Amino acid sequence: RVTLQEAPGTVPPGRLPRHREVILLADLVDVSKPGEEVEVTGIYKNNYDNAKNGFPVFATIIEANSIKRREDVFSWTEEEEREFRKISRDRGIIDKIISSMAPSIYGHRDIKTAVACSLFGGVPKNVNGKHSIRGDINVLLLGDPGTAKSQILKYVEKTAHRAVFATGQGASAVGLTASVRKDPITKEWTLEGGALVLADKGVCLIDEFDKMNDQDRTSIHEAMEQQSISISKAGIVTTLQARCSIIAAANPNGGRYNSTLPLAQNVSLTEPILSRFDILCVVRDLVDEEADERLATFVVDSHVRSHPENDSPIPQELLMKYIHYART
Amino acid sequence: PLRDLDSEHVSKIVRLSGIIISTSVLSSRATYLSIMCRNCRHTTSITINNFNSITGNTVSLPRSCLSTNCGPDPYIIIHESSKFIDQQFLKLQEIPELVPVGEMPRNLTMTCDRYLTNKVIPGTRVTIVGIYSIYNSAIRTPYIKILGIQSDVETS
Amino acid sequence: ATTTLTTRIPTPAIYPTEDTEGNKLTTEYGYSTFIDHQRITVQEMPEMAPAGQLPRSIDVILDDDLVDKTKPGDRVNVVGVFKSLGAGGMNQSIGFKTLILGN
Amino acid sequence: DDVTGEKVREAFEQFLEDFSVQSTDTGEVEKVYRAQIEFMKIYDLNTIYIDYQHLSMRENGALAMAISEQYYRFLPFLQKGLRRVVRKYAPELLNTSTERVFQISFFNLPTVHRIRDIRSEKIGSLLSISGTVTRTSEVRPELYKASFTCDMCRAIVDNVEQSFKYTEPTFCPNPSCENRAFWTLNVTRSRFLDWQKVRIQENANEIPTGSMPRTLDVILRGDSVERAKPGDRCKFTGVEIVVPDVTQLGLPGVKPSSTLSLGVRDLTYKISFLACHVISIDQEVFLNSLSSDEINELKEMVKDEHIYDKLVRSIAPAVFGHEAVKKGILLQMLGGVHKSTVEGIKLRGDINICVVGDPSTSKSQFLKYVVGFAPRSVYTSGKASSAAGLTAAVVRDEEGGDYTIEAGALMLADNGICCIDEFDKMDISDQVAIHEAMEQQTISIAKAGIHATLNARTSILAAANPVGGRYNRKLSLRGNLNMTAPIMSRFDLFFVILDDCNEKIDTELASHIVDLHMKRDEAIEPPFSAEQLRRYIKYARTFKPILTKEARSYLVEKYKELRKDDAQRSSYRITVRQLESMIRLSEAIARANCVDEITPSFIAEAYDLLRQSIIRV
Amino acid sequence: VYTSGKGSSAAGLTASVQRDPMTREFYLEGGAMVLADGGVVCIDEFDKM
Amino acid sequence: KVSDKRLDVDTSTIEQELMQNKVDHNEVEEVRQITDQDLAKIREVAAREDLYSLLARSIAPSIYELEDVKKGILLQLFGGTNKTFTKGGRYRGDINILLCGDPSTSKSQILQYVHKITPRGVYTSGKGSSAVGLTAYITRDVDTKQLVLESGALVLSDGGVCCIDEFDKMSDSTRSVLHEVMEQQTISIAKAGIITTLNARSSILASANPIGSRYNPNLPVTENIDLPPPLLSRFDLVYLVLDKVDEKNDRELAKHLTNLYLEDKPEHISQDDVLPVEFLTMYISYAKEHIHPIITEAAKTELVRAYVGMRKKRITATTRQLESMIRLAEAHAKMKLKNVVELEDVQEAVRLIRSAIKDYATDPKTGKIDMNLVQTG
Amino acid sequence: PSKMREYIAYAKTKRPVMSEAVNDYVVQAYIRLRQDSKREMDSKFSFGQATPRTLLGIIRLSQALAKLRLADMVDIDDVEEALRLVRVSKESLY
Ligand SMILES: Nc1ncnc2c1ncn2[C@@H]1O[C@H](COP(=O)(O)OP(=O)(O)O)[C@@H](O)[C@H]1O
Ligand SMILES: Nc1ncnc2c1ncn2[C@@H]1O[C@H](COP(=O)(O)OP(=O)(O)O)[C@@H](O)[C@H]1O
Ligand SMILES: Nc1ncnc2c1ncn2[C@@H]1O[C@H](COP(=O)(O)OP(=O)(O)O)[C@@H](O)[C@H]1O
Ligand code: BEF
Ligand SMILES: [Mg+2]
Ligand SMILES: [Mg+2]
Ligand SMILES: [Mg+2]
Ligand SMILES: [Zn+2]
Ligand SMILES: [Zn+2]
């Protein structure tokens, strides 16, 4: 059974979106994943028969016949490995990829270089258990507000493999901490790891990094130091594995970076938290009239191009597949 | 893979892996029990050796004296003469990292008996050899009888 | 079933309301006999229990002079028959009710 | 059979044909009911609207009184009479093409009953109620007529009427059977209608002293399903109905009970409503629902040069002397253009206003004015709200029942303005959650096994006070405001209201206040009436302004000048989100001028307004 | 067990007595100093405990 | 519902329902019927020269020598004009009074007197009250085993005087809900399951002590009161009841109390005659229903001049103070049964506002009360 | 305690009343106490400024002492003893 809810885009304002129960049978099972738009056809069947409403009322269930995602992007074929080698043979390919990183954004080439480094990552290694070395590169984006750190992280989510998005505080489906919670409707225990555990072989984007809870901070420290979150609740004594590269965005104290202070006074994170990072790029706001002019031109062009009534970089799909093959 | 379990695997030996997250308390089952008629005082001895491992109790007490009046439900279990074996319920969950991003990990109820009881503790990562099965609460509830627990190396 | 070790033939407990000849009967409290009954639960000792795992417990049925010989939280060594009671679902309505009759 | 029922049915079908209301000079006289029947045939609809005034006029209203007092008893007779009338004239629409159900709706009742006016002596009668919609359920089928499969001589009986409760067909497809113990329903030969339950609530103005609000459950059966969104004032017309209740088991008073064997059954009920229909209270559809004088009015405003100045002066007539706040609130009501790039990221256009100032500086006054003037708005205070109240809420449909979603404060503000008074007092957890929705523009529910993800396109108009009570000039905005810099960053605009001992303004304000108290709504001199303002606002919203090359150049130059102003210290620094704010404010101003093209003058005005927004510390 | 000063992600640094789910009775959830007994315990960030 | 020992229910708050209730044939005594002789007696009393002082001393007769306090309480009981706007909205004449000063100044007794006299009212005390406790809460009626909506102290005290004792001891978190109630006379609650606005036309009467449980002349007035300015701005009258060792005053008070201890259930030692509480309640009620003052132009000019005079550290002037003079003058006129507001009413209201805050003894630049100067018998 | 409780109940039955001369004595004592509190409002022995509750406490103690003798009429020596107790409550301070 798949519960279908109307897409929020087409819902008129002020109305509660409605849910209809779609029934999948035979080989139709597990052809969709939650959070993905679908286009399904089938019989609008009247479900079997509660006296809750008093009046005689039957539930409705839509039996399914054919479901197509509106839309394996990481699949491979010999011709595209030939292509990968061909583009790899080019000169300036590093700069081409960097210019390809976050195409929606303008400026801060250091940030693009750092995020590309994090995506490609170092070589995992394990010397027969004698010595273990992290094979990931962690990037921290400590920048002043309104510098598109959030949008950069959203782009990374779009363009990464095994990528999870977590927040320092608020509401999220991933809590950065291992937990044992029981669903009241079904009444059974589930062992859910944090975003760190979920991104076992990928990246974990942690926005609002400065605004973490104490438990979240401790779990972040554990994951970054030993690459293995341990859980000891409700009788479950085990150490889950989380070997993840962390791309984090944090805000300097006071909503602005003070240059005369060192990194210690600018961010509330303590030194052991920062030391495990590799690329600590501070996105300081720069007051240049010409840079602001070029930024405003970019922003205005993008904003006008989006109006419903008025209207060297590598393509994104190639970037996807080439990054995956490079890592693999 | 635990998500790849299919109706084609019903009543077939299936190899799969996961994590043990809960071990229920030992429950004693019947493998040989002596009964008596309340009227006839007729002793009997039922044997339930053939898969006394389904969740439900299958080979039930007779409602009439042997070969068949006696009166319905005349049988009482002589407890000091019966012989029992123990059953323990385990629950397996997919490895937490190898799950869809925003989806609750799929867990599957499992059952073991005799010398396979008290062989694992919650949190252990195990590989399971057992019979994929079906239990009625149109829909049915899948579960696995345990035949062998390949317990990996765990915390010392 | 508890008050005797061997399984006796089940005779339903019917309170005599009338005489054999239909005369009304007045129950005589203070002449009828009552026996103290107490059930205690014994859990695995924390000193010897494995750490980080759920505990296991057994139920003990005490009777007559054995009642109220313990306080919750005590460490006790109860000895008695490990009897199993009830049809245990074998009779149509998951195991058998198991308890340690207290000696 | 009943002779009186036959009489009322034949009279009903008689005046469905004989009735004819005059068209005065233009059109002579025409059969209004026959005209509606022709309209029904033309549009193939399923419900007929009958004015109660006409029935009152006809035959000294004796039949009107009879049908109003005992509507439920005569309803089948009404259906039969209408069916015979349809058979007489235009019987083509009789069948579905098995049979099409005809719905009769009465409108324009003489009186309106409030929810607290419900009485037992009106049970089963026709009346009207007026309430605010709180919870709406799914449109579900109900058994209009039910078919079943026989037990002995297994076979299906076809198209048997289903009453308000489960029914068993006395007759059988095999006449010799006469057995009905086990019937197996078949959906194919079972008719259905549309069922939806709406929980209305008593409006604020009708609440007595001290009483907490009272609410009623209204069932919409027919085409009227999903006709009202949560949080709207609607007028419901229908029949007063009762439904069995099992909850009132321990209540004081002797419980009515039926004895039959024994045949015991507790006759406990609760009052509900079955509404026949619901009435609420591009530019082409908008242009259509106006009168000629209204269109002339709106058009005259569109051409005037002083339209901007007059509109700005008209906002909040009671408040005197604050023009920046009026401009900001007017812009917020005019809204913006919300846009999505090719990338899928969405650019919100609606404006967010944060007002902070000294006590008694009319900060609430603007909030209290916005509610009652904007088409949809929600006003809330600080300590009197929670996160689950502001966003979507999860409650049981009934006690010990399945949980259901309830639209929160922001949901009623969808595509509207949500006024939040005393932001600083309102809880820090509620603070985090409200703001997080302002960034996301959506809300996600994951409590008690519900995964509904709503959309929140709402305009925030939030007021607050400086920490400690009174503003301090020397300290910057962030020092006197408890909020952190990014929270201010998400807001489009800021207005800071200051108090000072100036005798001229003190005298003018004292005179204004005393005059307002003495002469009420007298000589307040509003440039335009509120309805005209709302007419213009509704029209302006239809437009979607466009930019020019000069507009692009001027926007870039103004952003450059603002950034040069920053650390040229500032109250709060400037960002590119400020550039987006100027873009949306400029297009809002152009919409205010009803001009499809933004001029550099609009950009200059928006830039200047932001400049007074950032007062030098 | 390798334990941070504040403890592990969820595992406590020292023994903690809590209640089990199914009967709310006393049992030891864990703790580094008791789960690892008879061996060693490695505590990093000692000053943050 | 009606009793002669308490004020009758306000008809303005029940104006909406009575016309339909007459059709409903409920036939309950909503209002007490005033005889023609009673109306003539009321008019005769309104013609008396010492009406204001008489009605002041009639409230809380046993309380001795709290003259301004009793007058302010009387004015609050009368209330202001309940204006209504044709466009929409309404300005209500509910007077909110704060009492602050030394302990054992009979603030609690005045609070109890008011709580007894008013038709509808709830007496809460400091830490006892809570934010959901005032306003509204959801409760489970065990009889029906159903979540039933129930109102709190503020909504319960609608149309009456809500007595709050130990005001200072309340946490500022609980005090937040008073911000909307004391000004808009409504409470808008948007908690889980309910999203609406509630009408709470309740005039707060709050008693508190200065920080340190006693007045400190060294500290300024605003520091001694120690409340956020937005709160203190909402209060129309603030009383600095002061306990000062005056031999004549102490002798008079001691004589009054000791004489109160002369019988088992004695009579008031107040030498001056007082109106019996039955007629006093009848008079106040009748003045509430059948008097609706309108401000005159001369009163408007005097109000503007007075407001400018006050609006020229010590407590600051406020537009709420302007609306407070408006309400107080309206109430003073409504007491005199006059249908309009005159200049003397505004003068009396300004005198009350100045005297309650002890403005006649405070230094302008620094709010230190001149203890020798402020002394009054 | 049984006999003491019986006597205390019997005393609680009585409701004594004050006297004119007694009232004058109490009033003068309260005035003097208020003056004394005003004088040493910041001395080393400021046990607190006197309040009307002090007068009420004097009355209450005098009535209790009258009850103790099983009398319906407050006596002057009872007031003297109540004043003595109130004063010597702080006598150990020296
Ligand atoms: N370097 C940049 N180039 C283009 N647009 C930018 C740049 N920095 C910020 N923006 C834009 O500024 C706006 C503010 O949002 P964003 O910068 O993502 O917020 P924050 O950094 O505070 O999370 C966005 O529309 C973003 O695209
Ligand atoms: N510029 C003003 N114009 C009109 N009325 C004002 C003005 N300033 C203060 N007031 C009046 O004084 C009172 C102030 O209330 P208000 O400022 O809305 O409370 P808050 O400051 O907590 O938001 C209102 O009655 C309001 O009408
Ligand atoms: N001026 C006064 N007039 C009448 N009684 C007074 C006066 N001052 C004090 N009292 C009496 O002293 C006590 C103090 O009153 P209470 O309200 O309890 O004090 P507080 O003002 O601290 O709340 C009461 O018994 C009261 O009757
Ligand atoms: F000592 Be009092 F209650 F202000
Ligand atoms: Mg951000
Ligand atoms: Mg306000
Ligand atoms: Mg007090
Ligand atoms: Zn037998
Ligand atoms: Zn049949």
Author numbering:
A (entry chain B): 387 to 435, 439 to 460, 472 to 711, 756 to 772
B (entry chain E): 147 to 214, 235 to 303, 322 to 340
C (entry chain C): 217 to 309, 315 to 324
D (entry chain F): 104 to 200, 259 to 421, 442 to 462, 500 to 786, 790 to 838
E (entry chain E): 437 to 485
F (entry chain D): 468 to 779, 789 to 853
G (entry chain G): 635 to 728
Reported in the publication:
Notably, Cdc7 is considered one of the most crucial regulators of the cell cycle, and it is one of only two kinases that are essential for the initiation of DNA replication.
In the MD-(ADP-BeF3) structure we did not observe non-canonical nucleotide binding, however, in comparison to MD-(ATPγS), an alternative canonical nucleotide-binding state was observed. ADP-BeF3 was only present in three Mcm ATP binding pockets, while ADP was seen at the Mcm5/2, Mcm2/6 and Mcm6/4 interfaces. Surprisingly, with ADP-BeF3 we observed a structural change in the double-hexamer interface, with the Mcm6 zinc finger becoming repositioned and the Mcm2 zinc finger adopting greater flexibility, resulting in a gap near the Mcm2/5 gate. Interestingly, by docking dsDNA of the MCM2-7-DH and forked DNA of the CMG into the MD-(ADP-BeF3) complex one can observe that the lagging strand of the CMG-fork DNA can almost pass through the Mcm2/5 gate, but is clashing with the flexible Mcm2 zinc finger. While our previous work had identified that the lagging strand in the context of the DH is pressed against the Mcm2/5 interface, our data here suggest that the Mcm ATP/ADP binding state is communicated allosterically with the DH-interface, inducing a reorganisation of Mcm6 and Mcm2 zinc fingers that may occur during helicase activation and could support the escape of single-stranded DNA through the Mcm2/5 gate. As such, the MD-(ADP-BeF3) structure may emulate changes that occur during the assembly of the replication fork and hint at a potential DNA unwinding mechanism.
